């Protein structure tokens, strides 16, 4: 069983260290946040959250980092060394680079003025990574809501909640121009955009996202507060300004029917929506992980201990 005070005797520190490397890296990136709270959402739905992500290739088994939702896309893997070492140097050989991972995504969230809560602990680190099995678990943004409510239950969160609340994670961070073009120019070989997006919003996404333009160019995925961790996604959604297809669908899919009422709920509260967050997120963070003594306590964590 996952407990928060895993670490409060041999390592209880490790919070700090992790605070103190984030805030550090947020002066010269201030999207660190963001992408670390995103890699542990990568790590936790492939195998669980086992660090399996923070692996490098070798020639016995494919790195995730290639996987189509992590190519080009993942980011903040330097930062995670950095604190790892920090902590080994703190506490050697004594916290799993899949501990560290979720502690570095709860404190990003609360840097980021979200929620402050202990996260369960005690979560070991695997012995390969799982290249397929990521291009079949990540969600894509183009999934439909019945194909994300899929996605989620395949790997064991059940809930509406779980998927309206984590989703709030795009109250931050930014998105490619790739992943909306079609809502853009061409939804469903329609020829036309997407009719749930604003018409207002549309033409500014366009300006940023002309046809065939960079396809890499960055947009913020919350236009009301880019780096901020609040509900003010949910108030994007109904109002049609949701950024990507999955964010919208929330609210407009014909299947919204009981994803509309917690969209809703989380944008007329910060306290509703910050606590539904916090139980999503520690129920995605005890997605089977690996306990006691199966797998290590790798100490780089881009390699399995020899
Ligand atoms: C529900 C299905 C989801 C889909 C389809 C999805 C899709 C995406 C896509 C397309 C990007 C842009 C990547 C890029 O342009 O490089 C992204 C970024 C991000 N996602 Fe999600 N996501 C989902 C769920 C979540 C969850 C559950 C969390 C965390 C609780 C999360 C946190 C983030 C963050 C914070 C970023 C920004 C990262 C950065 O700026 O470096 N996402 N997501
Ligand atoms: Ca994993
Ligand atoms: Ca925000």
Known sequence: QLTP????????????????????????DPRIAASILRLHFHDCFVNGCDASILLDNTTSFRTEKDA???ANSARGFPVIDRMKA???????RTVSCADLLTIAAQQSVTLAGGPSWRVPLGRRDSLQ????????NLPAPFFTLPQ???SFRNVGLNRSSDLVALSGGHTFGKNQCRFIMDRLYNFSNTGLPDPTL???????????????????????????????FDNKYYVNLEEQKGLIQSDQELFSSPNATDTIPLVRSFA????????????????????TPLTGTQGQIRLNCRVVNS
């Open 5 to 28: 005070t895993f670490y409060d005797n041999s390592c209880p520190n490790v919070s700090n260290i992790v605070r103190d490397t984030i805030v550090n890296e947020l002066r010269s």
């Open 86 to 92: 920090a902590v080994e140097s703190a506490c050697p």
């Open 148 to 150: 994300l409510k899929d």
């Open 198 to 228: 604003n018409t207002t919003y549309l033409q500014t996404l366009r300006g940023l996202c002309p046809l065939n333009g960079n396809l890499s160019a960055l947009v913020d995925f919350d236009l009301r507060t880019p780096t901020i």
């Open 268 to 287: 007329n509260s910060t306290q509703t929506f910050f606590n539904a967050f916090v139980e999503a997120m520690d129920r995605m963070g005890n997605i």
């Open 68 to 70: 189509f939702g992590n």
């Open 129 to 136: 990574a799982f290249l397929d099995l990521a291009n079949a």
